[PDB]
Design a protein around this ligand. Structure first.
Ligand SMILES: CCCCCCCC/C=C\CCCCCCCC(=O)O[C@@H](COC(=O)CCCCCCCCCCCCCCC)COP(=O)([O-])OCC[N+](C)(C)C
Ligand SMILES: CCCCCCCC/C=C\CCCCCCCC(=O)O[C@@H](COC(=O)CCCCCCCCCCCCCCC)COP(=O)([O-])OCC[N+](C)(C)C
Ligand SMILES: CC(=O)N[C@H]1[C@@H](OP(=O)(O)OP(=O)(O)OC[C@H]2O[C@@H](n3ccc(=O)[nH]c3=O)[C@H](O)[C@@H]2O)O[C@H](CO)[C@@H](O)[C@@H]1O
Ligand SMILES: CC(=O)N[C@H]1[C@@H](OP(=O)(O)OP(=O)(O)OC[C@H]2O[C@@H](n3ccc(=O)[nH]c3=O)[C@H](O)[C@@H]2O)O[C@H](CO)[C@@H](O)[C@@H]1O
Ligand SMILES: [Mg+2]
Ligand SMILES: [Mg+2]
Lengths: 700, 700
């Protein structure tokens, strides 16, 4: 048909039996896509939405990218989607959604790898009627087929998902859903799945909004509709929602101390950072979040530089052009906001949420955060370096000024996060030596012991992150996290104990610690109260404080030590039937003997590797230059403050031209500066959250 | 023939033409070896030496192992061998060698990899008549052939090797040579080549002595005979010779400062360490050296534990059993010396030498020394741990005592080499702070600058050795070596300057530096004079002193950071002739549709990796535990001596229960202890060399 392989094989008699309990419900269509994603329209490839008597104008296209997820995660995502669609078809007073909105929504499941996909998921997919085995082809007319497209409109919905089963039923209350199962055949990464979603089927369907989901992310009963409502404002070019950690049956997972930490971290992030950024107009949407992008807004330059990167490039490598892939989705946001002659803004929707599952062991936690930290660091660097693009866009003067201010503040936060390695050690060492030097009881030996414990855990973390893999050594990482938590406890004890003794004595530089610690805690709590989600402030808060030194001295170290994933990397056969082989006049020729010799004589008379190894060498050099600069700059700060690195020796020698004192006023000055910075950051984020809630309330 | 593939195809008419200028000169025999090395005799595989009317009893078997060497290196080795054979056939007053000794010597060339071999070498090999293309088979009777054996007795010899050609002639003065070209087909390592040499063809030939050569190692005009003469003493179970760096045409390569360093290092090693060990009776033969092993001595337990390792082992891993492969050839020596009920000794022959080619760039130099350092470290650890085996052997009481003493002294040297990382820094820092503290002029800033330069070059060396590869970053390694050489120059200047000023003033702890530095230099020079090879003592000596800090702070770091090489790591096709394909009743069946669905339904109802990854994880853990212990122990020494690591702070706090002084007497005590150790080592090696020369002279 039209030069492409197609097939319409009716679904199983069983499925068709319940579906009946029109043509598109009754056949399942297959399509062998053998072209590039950016050639779907010109190759005469189409989708059923475009074949009926009246073509279907789609309003919302939902992309689910699955790699090897079990049927539970995918079933969770699909159940969320079907619940949303049922809500949107039961809506009464609405111009867009209605009893036939099931026709304006398309679900696109871009599976990755025919080898990698879990059959557990294909069981669910075929049970829904969007897939069946037998007619998947491996190459068509000397061309390898790039992916397989199965299209069905199933009338069944998942209504219950226990810990082991998914309940599929077909009643008068179920709604049809337009599935579209894409299935790549070889393991190309997530960016290629997005390339198929955006440059491929979105070019044929022409949706209004394009929503990106993952496998295992459950949207709420009402989340997708609330995210769709954000695009009423014609200036909105993107949006995102809140991300909740799901705690399992009656919050059983809170007993794990690595899940409570992430619960508090997620809810703090959503309450403070997302609202503060959304006030200005530019967001940097969280990885696990589900986002939506107006097709017109992302169409053109944003997509082009998200997929291919900076085109202007010679045969050699350039820094931003060849590393931008580390900040994958955060380039779409930056290019949408700063589009030329266009005033798109990014908005954060709090009425839309989705509950995802978080890692529960340290190895996978570290491996997950390795991508987040690198992405956030490179995205901030790039966005700060290219802030002049804000003044070439179409925004008004006030919105350009606001975006410039936000880009400066984001780089300020990145600069703070870069020096955390030295900041934590400086605070810890100054505090432990100050209390020892003031009270003398047993804190001298504790100071020495804790200095040595940190150094044995920092050195080992560097070495294992540079050479080993987290899965190989999990017990050591658990031990390191426990040791850092104990050090945190000791730091808290020192601060409280000296503050209490100074209160009894009344010093300023230590009673100030009480002043700030209370201010930032109260700002956190007041923001939580205003956001109307305050239970995290006590339920899962302590574990965040204890596993916070391990987020600054383990996740950061592994993230920086693993910037890029560097993977370095006949004739003749005899089978005699029975003591007898094949004879001939070949070789017997003597002239050939003088001819299979003269050639060899001449070869004793006559007297850079591929692009992959070159790119790998460049990536390794970049990774080892970043690490070295990080360590050197942090030690520069430490040696300037504590007078380590032989500086105190040098000053003593100049004075002789004496001996080293125990502590100086630089320690006090630095100790005040750090808490001032922390207080300023907390104040800024509190003000941002307050403005967000006030504006939202007035608009509502 | 006998169930194995054979072929006797006369050599090229050209070759045969000059050979004539008997049967074995005229045919070249091929053999497809499809068994294991330890099965050659039982498989009814033989070699021509065993087929004549009178079987040939071989006296000397020479093994040359080549991997991808050009025809120049292999031609060099072959020319050395043919010169030796000519010398041994022209000998007059000898019971063994004579006009027919060409019959008692077999050359075995165990090439590795049909894919890896350089055709440049096959040109030379076929030009000699020991190889010709066309009848090499890839598998025989459903069995893959393991290697190809070509056997010829060529009458041509190489008589001149210019920089670009090898001169092959056939006169009345040439001698026949019994070549035997082994050619493995897949890249198995050198230990498997030795397994073929020892468990394979040596089992058929039954030689008296087995000599191991490499491609590119040129034995002298008389070296092999002088090595053979060492086995007259029935107690000798092995032997080795001197290794000379060849300097090229009129010593042009001495202009390179990385070749002069290795020249001096090699000649010092041969003069001191080999003679000192050979006095006791156990040697640990240098890597590039060519060695000989009596077959009876190595036959049995030594070979068995060289090839397979410790047999007693459960499913899990053990340290020595699973890492002994790092000390490859040094296990043969240890097992020969300590053989049960046998009194074999290892002797060092100085009358036999061989000139090899040394690396001239820093990346390949580091990569070469990475194997030497790991091998020497593990071999010393194993030999010290198993010294009790010396008292279970057959030696007399005095020789057991001598071997025990030697094993203790070797581990003492290893223990010294383990702490060199801290020793160098301690000496450097104490010296630079002492001169600054005494003279004040400009040495304060130099002390700070040099402390920072060392730390920026040590940190970078750790990071690049752990993450990167030497070939990727050569400029930085050159820069680091230059910086370390400048630091060495500054240390020498400080020592000389303070010693001169103390001489003018007359302190003891610095004029002592002059006392030792002169004693060790004079012992070096006197040993060189006695060994009668004194030109290295001035020609290539300075470059060894300047590139010595880079042998302690670059080769060691890379060797320890790279202990083991950790490499982590369908149906359907359509080709329509013309808009028409293959149709059938397959799939059309509806029952199958309900059958390709019920299976999937059930798969949604039903509700450690391989040995390689486990071994890789174990190896990585071992590598990262060794590194951590090395760094921790060296810093323990440094912090105890210099009172770093917060110890001085702790002592000051106890005294308050004051402030840190600049330097203590621990620095003086350590500084004296180090030079005392150096003087003791130099004295021991000088005495060993003197005893060696005196004994050899008296015996001669
Ligand atoms: C240590 C024990 C374990 C050793 C383990 C193994 C050996 C490793 C080298 C240890 C060298 C210690 C030297 C020393 O005295 O430390 C000093 C600095 O302390 C630090 O800043 C070091 C922190 C630990 C780094 C460990 C290496 C990890 C890689 C790199 C990771 C990033 C490193 C940078 C992070 C910001 C101690 O400072 P102080 O004396 O308290 O200051 C007052 C000085 N005064 C009295 C003159 C006023
Ligand atoms: C540094 C600049 C570059 C930083 C680069 C980058 C940051 C790395 C951490 C630097 C921490 C320095 C802390 C410091 O003051 O150093 C101290 C120790 O000095 C050493 O022993 C450190 C030697 C360099 C190690 C660099 C790390 C490489 C990995 C590990 C390699 C193996 C490490 C162990 C090798 C034996 C200085 O000692 P001192 O003050 O002169 O002693 C007298 C003290 N007193 C006055 C109280 C009496
Ligand atoms: C290197 C690594 O171990 N990554 C970890 C991390 O990354 P992280 O969670 O960032 O990444 P995910 O693998 O979860 O990727 C998110 C989306 O990508 C799809 N998709 C598609 C193609 C592809 O190559 N990769 C891919 O992930 C995924 O199923 C999902 O749809 O998350 C999890 C920890 O809880 C673990 O699964 C992993 O240990
Ligand atoms: C990892 C590495 O880079 N090794 C380096 C080093 O090791 P090094 O010199 O120790 O090792 P060699 O490769 O020279 O090995 C010696 C003998 O082994 C044969 N043989 C056989 C099989 C096999 O797998 N390997 C093998 O080496 C060799 O040709 C030779 O006959 O020496 C040289 C530096 O000047 C370089 O060639 C290499 O950069
Ligand atoms: Mg997931
Ligand atoms: Mg070689």
């Amino acid at each position: 048909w039209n030069g492409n392989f197609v097939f319409d094989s009716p679904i199983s008699k069983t499925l068709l039996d319940q579906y009946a309990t029109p043509n598109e419900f009754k056949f399942m269509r297959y399509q062998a896509v053998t072209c590039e994603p950016n050639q779907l329209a010109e190759k005469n490839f189409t989708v059923r939405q475009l074949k009926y008597l009246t073509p279907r104008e789609t309003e919302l296209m939902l992309v689910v990218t699955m790699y090897n997820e079990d049927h539970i995660l995918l079933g969770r995502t699909l159940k969320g989607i079907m619940d949303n669609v049922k809500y949107m078809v039961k809506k009464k007073n609405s111009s867009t959604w209605g009893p036939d909105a099931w026709k304006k929504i398309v679900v696109c499941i871009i599976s990755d790898g025919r080898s990698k996909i879990n059959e557990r998921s294909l069981a669910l997919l075929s049970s829904l009627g969007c897939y069946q085995d037998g007619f998947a082809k491996d190459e068509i007319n000397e061309k390898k087929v790039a992916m397989h497209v199965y299209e069905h409109t199933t009338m069944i919905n998942i209504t219950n998902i226990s810990e082991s089963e998914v309940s599929l039923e077909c009643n008068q209350g179920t709604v049809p859903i337009q599935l579209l199962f894409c299935l790549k055949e070889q393991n190309q990464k997530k960016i290629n799945s997005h390339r198929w979603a955006f440059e491929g089927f979105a070019e044929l369907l022409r949706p209004n909004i394009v929503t990106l989901l993952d496998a295992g992310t459950m949207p709420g009963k009402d989340s997708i509709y609330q995210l769709w409502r954000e695009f009423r404002n014609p200036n909105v070019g993107g949006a995102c929602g809140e991300i909740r950690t799901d705690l399992g049956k009656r919050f059983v997972k809170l007993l794990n101390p690595l899940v409570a930490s992430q619960n508090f971290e997620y809810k703090m992030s959503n309450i403070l950072d997302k609202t503060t950024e959304s006030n200005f107009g530019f967001i940097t949407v969280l990885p696990g979040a589900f986002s939506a992008y107006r097709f017109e807004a992302v169409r053109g330059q944003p997509l082009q530089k998200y997929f291919y990167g900076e085109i202007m490039e010679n045969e050699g490598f350039h820094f931003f052009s060849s590393n931008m892939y580390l900040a994958e989705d955060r380039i779409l946001c930056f290019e949408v906001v700063t589009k030329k002659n266009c005033n798109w803004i990014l908005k954060y929707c709090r009425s839309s949420y989705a509950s995802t599952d978080v890692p529960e062991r340290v190895p996978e936690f570290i491996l997950q955060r390795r991508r987040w930290l690198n992405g956030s660091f490179f995205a901030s660097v790039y966005s700060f370096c290219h802030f002049y693009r804000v003044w070439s866009s179409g925004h008004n003067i006030g919105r350009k000024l606001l975006l410039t201010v936000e880009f400066f503040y984001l780089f300020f936060n990145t600069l703070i996060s870069w020096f955390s390695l030295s900041s934590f050690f400086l605070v810890f060492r100054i505090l432990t030596v100050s209390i020892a030097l003031a009270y003398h009881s047993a804190f001298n030996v504790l100071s020495v012991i804790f200095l040595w414990l940190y150094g044995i855990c920092t050195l080992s973390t560097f070495i294992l992150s540079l050479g080993n893999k987290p899965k190989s050594t999990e017990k050591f990482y658990v031990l390191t996290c426990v040791i850092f938590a104990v050090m945190m406890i000791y730091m808290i004890f020192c601060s409280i104990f000296m503050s209490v003794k100074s209160f009894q004595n009344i010093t300023e530089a230590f009673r100030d610690i009480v002043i700030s610690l209370g201010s930032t805690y109260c700002l956190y709590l007041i923001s939580s109260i205003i956001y109307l989600q305050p239970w995290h402030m006590l339920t899962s808060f302590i574990q965040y404080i204890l596993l916070s030194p391990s987020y600054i001295n383990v996740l950061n170290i592994y993230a920086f030590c693993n910037v890029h994933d560097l993977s370095w990397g006949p004739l003749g056969k005899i089978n005699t039937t029975e003591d007898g082989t094949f004879k001939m006049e070949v070789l017997v020729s003597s002239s050939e003997i003088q001819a299979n010799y003269d050639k060899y004589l001449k070869v004793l008379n006559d007297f850079e590797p591929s692009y992959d190894e070159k790119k790998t060498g460049y990536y390794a050099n970049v990774r080892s230059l970043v690490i070295i600069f990080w360590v050197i700059t942090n030690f520069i700060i430490v040696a300037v403050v504590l007078e380590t690195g032989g500086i105190a020796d040098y000053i003593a020698m100049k004075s002789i031209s004496a001996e080293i004192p125990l502590m100086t006023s630089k320690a006090s000055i630095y100790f005040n500066v750090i808490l001032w910075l922390v207080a300023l950051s907390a104040l800024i984020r509190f003000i941002g959250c307050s403005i967000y809630m006030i504006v939202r309330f007035f608009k509502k």
